[PDB]
Design a protein around this ligand. Structure first.
Ligand SMILES: [Zn+2]
Ligand SMILES: [Zn+2]
Length: 241
């Protein structure tokens, strides 16, 4: 379409930034928005990497889904992060320090192997095991993020079925009208320009999977809620939701 493609483009224009939305069904992708070249541009994944971090940590028994990651008492970026919490709690809160502890439990050698085995973005994690998804060198395109989400949704990533199911549960947002929505946001504010993400999928009522990845530039004055709003509005305009 042109008319729904034009309304999605204008959703991004009305937000006064550039962005793309990649949709995947089966093995075919379509892009929408006001800067389609973002779809094949690499950006740091920021907190969307927690999806893969959690898969790796659970697969290799560096954590359990019930384990509590203790706050060590040091000041964290947000007061909401200064709590003991599970990987699932930390996923919903995008609690970076919890997943940095997880990354250190995994360690550089195992982390690098699993990122390359999965084939995630440029698959380069460098030498610093607890920030490579925030400041580089790891980068991924929106097309690759939507492909990653599709495989996680279909449990075809190279991990056990049980671990993929557990990370799916950490990503569940809501079910409406039989549509199950899963998503993880991301905000890379330590790079310039700043990247904003919302990656996930919709399980349509018959079990059919529609994966997505929104990627835009986070400029000052642009509220964080823009990512979910444009995603949901676009999915409605495409009849996915
Ligand atoms: Zn305006
Ligand atoms: Zn292992």
């Amino acid at each position: 379409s042109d008319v729904k493609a034009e309304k999605i483009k204008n959703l991004f224009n009305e937000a006064h930034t550039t962005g793309v939305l990649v949709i995947q069904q089966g093995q075919t992708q379509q892009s929408y928005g006001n800067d389609l070249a973002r779809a094949s541009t690499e950006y740091v994944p920021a907190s969307t990497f927690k999806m893969l971090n959690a898969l790796i940590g659970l697969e290799h028994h560096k954590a359990t889904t019930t384990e509590v990651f203790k706050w060590d008492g040091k000041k964290r970026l947000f007061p909401e992060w200064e709590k003991d919490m599970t990987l699932g709690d930390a996923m919903k809160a995008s609690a970076i320090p919890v997943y940095q502890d997880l990354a250190r439990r995994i360690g550089l050698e195992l982390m690098s192997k699993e990122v390359k085995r999965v084939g995630y973005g440029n698959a380069d994690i460098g030498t610093q095991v607890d920030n490579f998804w925030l400041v580089g060198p790891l980068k991924i395109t929106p097309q690759q993020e939507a492909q990653f989400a599709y495989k996680l949704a279909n449990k075809t990533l190279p991990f056990s079925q049980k671990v993929q199911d557990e990370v799916q549960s950490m990503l569940f947002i809501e079910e409406k009208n039989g549509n199950k929505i899963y998503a993880k946001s991301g905000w890379g504010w330590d790079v310039n320009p700043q990247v904003g993400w919302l990656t996930g999928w919709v399980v349509q009522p018959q079990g059919n999977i529609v994966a997505f990845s929104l990627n835009l530039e986070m400029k000052k004055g642009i509220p964080s809620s823009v990512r979910k709003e444009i995603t949901y509005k676009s999915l409605e305009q495409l009849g996915i939701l």
